[PDB]
Structure formats: structure tokens, C-alpha cells
Amino acid sequence: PKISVAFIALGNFCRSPMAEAIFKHEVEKANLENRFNKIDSFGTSNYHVGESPDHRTVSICKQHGVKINHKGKQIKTKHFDEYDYIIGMDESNINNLKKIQPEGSKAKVCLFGDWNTNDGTVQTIIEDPWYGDIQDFEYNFKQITYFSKQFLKKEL
Numbered sequence: 001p002k003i004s005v006a007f008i009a010l011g012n013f014c015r016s017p018m019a020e021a022i023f024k025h026e027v028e029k030a031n032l033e034n035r036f037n038k039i040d041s042f043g044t045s046n047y048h049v050g051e052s053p054d055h056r057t058v059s060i061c062k063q064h065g066v067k068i069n070h071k072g073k074q075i076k077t078k079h080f081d082e083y084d085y086i087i088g089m090d091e092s093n094i095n096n097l098k099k100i101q102p103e104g105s106k107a108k109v110c111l112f113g114d115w116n117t118n119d120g121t122v123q124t125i126i127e128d129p130w131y132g133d134i135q136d137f138e139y140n141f142k143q144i145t146y147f148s149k150q151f152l153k154k155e156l
């Protein structure tokens with residue numbers, strides 16, 4: 001039974017759209033598209049609804065040959081029954097999602113870094129790069145790619 005994954009953070013502008021794009025790219029590279037139904041990204045906030053992702057997230061993806069095309073969208077309560085995994089970037093994301101999640105809904109809310117090996121390659125928390133520089137977006141790329149592979153390796 002295919003699985004559906006939603007990456008959800010705060011603004012659906014920096015990290016979540018990058019995570020959706022990189023994950024799709026790794027799924028394709030691994031030739032496992034058949035195991036998945038939906039792979040999306042949302043934000044708990046409506047601040048960037050309708051907007052294309054941060055130009056720095058777009059640049060970083062393009063620089064790595066990762067396709068990305070998205071418009072900001074806000075989480076909906078039904079998303080907890082729609083997706084098998086609802087993956088946050090940082091702890092504040094989890095706090096908010098856990099407070100919104102209807103009891104008994106199927107979605108397994110978790111931090112992407114939960115798939116970290118803790119082998120020193122990357123840190124567990126995917127920090128919001130918005131107030132930073134392109135190097136923070138670059139490090140996010142590295143973390144998301146790493147957790148993407150770990151996920152495909154552990155969940156399938």
C-alpha cells in the first residue's frame with residue numbers, strides 16, 4: 001500500500017518546500033516512485049500561501065539538479081487522515097502539529113531528524129534559514145537529503 005508523506009513546517013516557504021522537492025528527487029533516484037501516493041508540503045501558517053518558495057531554496061535545489069515547483073499552502077485538519085507521515089523540520093513544528101492533530105487520526109507526526117543516525121554527518125534539527133544566508137539553505141539541503149535516504153531505507 002503506497003504511503004503518503006507531507007513535510008510541514010511554519011511558513012511553507014523555506015524548508016518544507018525544499019524537503020518535498022528533495023524527497024521526491026531521492027524517491028525517483030532510488031526508483032521507488034511506485035511505493036508512494038502523495039508527497040507534499042504545507043505550513044502551519046498562512047503567511048506565504050500562494051507563493052513560490054524562497055529564491056534561496058530554489059537556487060540551492062537548482063544547483064543540485066533537484067526539480068522544484070510549489071505554491072505555499074496551509075495545513076488542514078483532514079491532512080492528518082490523508083497522510084501516513086507528517087514530518088516537521090524543528091521542535092516548534094512538532095509542538096504545533098501535536099496540538100492540532102485530531103486524536104485517532106492516522107498521520108504519524110514526527111521530526112525528519114528522527115531518521116538521523118547520529119553518526120556526526122548532520123545535525124538532527126533542520127533550522128529555519130530565513131534570517132540567515134544561502135549557506136544555511138545549503139546545510140538544510142544536506143540534512144534533508146540525508147534524512148530522505150535514511151527514511152527510504154528504514155520505512156519501506
Ligand SMILES: [Cl-]
Pocket residue numbers: 009010044092093094096097
Ligand atoms: Cl510550526
